[PDB]
Swiss-Prot record:
Gene Ontology terms describing biological process: cell adhesion; zinc ion import across plasma membrane; zinc ion transport
Keyword Disulfide bond listed: yes
Family: Belongs to the bacterial solute-binding protein 9 family.
Record organism: Escherichia coli (strain K12)
InterPro entries linked: Bact_metal-bind_prot9, Lipoprotein_PsaA-like, ZnuA, ZnuA-like
Disulfide bonds: 207-261
GO molecular function: zinc ion binding
Protein name in UniProt: High-affinity zinc uptake system protein ZnuA
Keywords, ordered alphabetically: Disulfide bond, Ion transport, Metal-binding, Periplasm, Signal, Transport, Zinc, Zinc transport
Gene3D superfamilies documented for this protein: Nitrogenase molybdenum iron protein domain (3.40.50.1980)
Lineage, opening ranks: Bacteria, Pseudomonadati, Pseudomonadota, Gammaproteobacteria, Enterobacterales
Function: Part of the ATP-binding cassette (ABC) transport system ZnuABC involved in zinc import. Binds zinc with high affinity and specificity and delivers it to the membrane permease for translocation into the cytoplasm.
Binding site for Zn(2+): 33-34, 98, 162
Encoding gene, per UniProt annotation: znuA
Length: 265
């Protein structure tokens, strides 16, 4: 099996290992990449895997140790890929590491995954070559449809609770006003809520986007009295099932959630 750290990384692997082998994920749906911790059973899935794929230390800190013990042939660290390095975006930690939101980086990742697997399974060279060409052409169109859907949305100001979308937004021309650091289970106190509210108004935002782990109480609260719509983004694709075209669908979903709140002047 190919073992991915996060679900949308699994989406990339899933497209390359389609037919050929299984794909597993370690971050379960509902958890955030910056607070998880490896179960003993998680560590066992790693050691016994054909290929491990993660973003790197600066992101899934919770995988440094067990990965550090695997030989190079068994591991793709996305942030360290030759072709990824020049695509890293700034904004201690200074490069943005939410990399599965960059088609370009997804493309390098599939190539690297294709490289490792084909070295191991050379009989399956044919299913894999086909898999790679399938992903590339599927991603290209998706990129095309998603550009079309989002371009009429340039200049529609939004805020997000979690500033994780930079790669996607730079790629598709979308324009984030900023971000607020909120719970997602405990409504903020009056000082903080007023500062957030003041900015939604001062800057006349159209939307404010939450994540699915956000309690609707917290979100509803922030938009109450304003004229701002409430949206939900799913950057970890918890709504999406692993499979050949999971990645295409992931980006599609994500653009609809943007569109659905942002559309409407």
């Amino acid at each position: 099996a190919v073992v991915a750290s996060l679900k949308p990384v699994g989406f990339i692997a899933s497209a390359i290992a389609d037919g050929v082998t299984e794909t597993e994920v370690l971050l379960p749906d509902g958890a955030s990449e910056h607070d998880y911790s490896l179960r003993p059973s998680d560590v066992k899935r790693l050691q016994n895997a054909d290929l491990v794929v993660w973003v790197g230390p600066e992101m899934e800190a919770f995988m440094q140790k067990p990965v550090s013990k695997l030989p190079g042939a068994k591991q793709v660290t996305i942030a360290q890929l030759e072709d990824v390095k020049p695509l890293l975006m700034k904004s201690h930690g200074d490069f943005n590491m939410h990399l599965w939101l960059s088609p370009e980086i997804a493309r390098a990742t599939a190539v690297a995954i294709h490289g490792k697997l084909v070295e191991l399974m050379p009989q399956s060279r044919a299913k894999l070559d086909a898999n790679l060409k399938d992903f590339e052409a599927q991603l290209a169109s998706t990129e095309t449809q998603v550009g079309n859907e989002l371009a009429p949305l340039k200049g529609k100001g939004y805020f997000v609770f979690h500033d994780a979308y930079g790669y996607f937004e730079k790629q598709f021309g979308l324009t984030p006003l900023g971000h607020f650091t909120v719970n997602p289970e405990i409504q903020p106190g009056a000082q903080r809520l007023h500062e957030i509210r003041t900015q939604l108004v001062e800057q006349k935002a159209t939307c404010v986007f939450a994540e699915p782990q956000f309690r609707p109480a917290v979100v509803e609260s922030v938009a109450r009295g304003t004229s701002v719509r409430m949206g939900t983004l799913d950057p970890l694709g918890t709504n999406i099932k692993l499979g050949k075209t999971s990645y295409s669908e992931f980006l599609s979903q994500l653009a609809n959630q943007y569109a659905s709140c942002l559309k409407g002047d």
